[PDB]
Amino acid sequence: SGKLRLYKEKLEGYNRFYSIVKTIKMVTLAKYRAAQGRIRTRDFSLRYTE
Amino acid sequence: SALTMAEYFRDVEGQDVLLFIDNIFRFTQANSEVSALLGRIPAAVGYQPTLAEDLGQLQERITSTTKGSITSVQAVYVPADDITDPAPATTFSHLDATTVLDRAVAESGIYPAVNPLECASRIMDPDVIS
Structure with a gap:
């Protein structure tokens, strides 16, 4: 039946959306994991700039 | 009736004939309409069991x-764009x-x-086509 499959298609789209968004999280986490280093090495360059 | 005319041209005249049908679904729809009055229990969706x-x-x-x-070309109506319907699928x-x-x-x-x-063809094989 089309009405039932309308929901199935709608839920099919949400599934791919979750996968793509989860892929986005993987990318950002890698960038954040490598950008976390600055937290260690900051707060000392700008001393006489103050 | 039309198919009978084409069959005669095929057999007796031995000719290559074209047969266009529009719409073949109505043949099924009409039989479903009369099926109720013939004392036949409806099948799924509401078509005749036959x-x-x-x-x-x-x-x-x-x-x-x-x-x-x-060479037959037939037009099939897919009710409410539902290709899961018994008639289009059959x-x-x-x-x-x-x-x-x-x-x-x-x-x-x-x-x-x-x-x-979603389309398909039987002659989509390298042996038949280039």
């Missing part, structure tokens, strides 16, 4: 034999080339509104 057999007898007559050839196994049209394609300005991902 949907598959009645269509098969007609379809098998529409074929090319050793005497002649019939007609898929009785064809050599299916052209599935989609409303979304037409709404985008593409004509003919063919969905190539």
Whole structure:
């Protein structure tokens, strides 16, 4: 039946959306994991700039 | 009636004939309308229980034999764009080339509104075509 499959298609789209968004999280986490280093090495360059 | 005329041209005249039918679904729809008054319990969706057999007898007559050839082009109506419906589905196994049209394609300005991902052909084999 089309009405039932309308929901199935709608839920099919949400599934791919979750996968793509989860892929986005993987990318950002890698960038954040490598950008976390600055937290260690900051707060000392700008001393006489103050 | 028309199929009988084509059969005569195929057999007696030994000619290659074209047979256009529009719409073959109405043949099924009409039999469903009378099915209720013939004392037959409706099947799923609400078609007659003899949907598959009645269509098969007609379809098998529409074929090319050793005497002649019939190139048949039949238009099938998919009610409410539901290709899971018993009538459209029952007609898929009785064809050599299916052209599935989609409303979304037409709404985008593409004509003919063919969905190539859903169409199929029997001669799509290297042995037959180049």
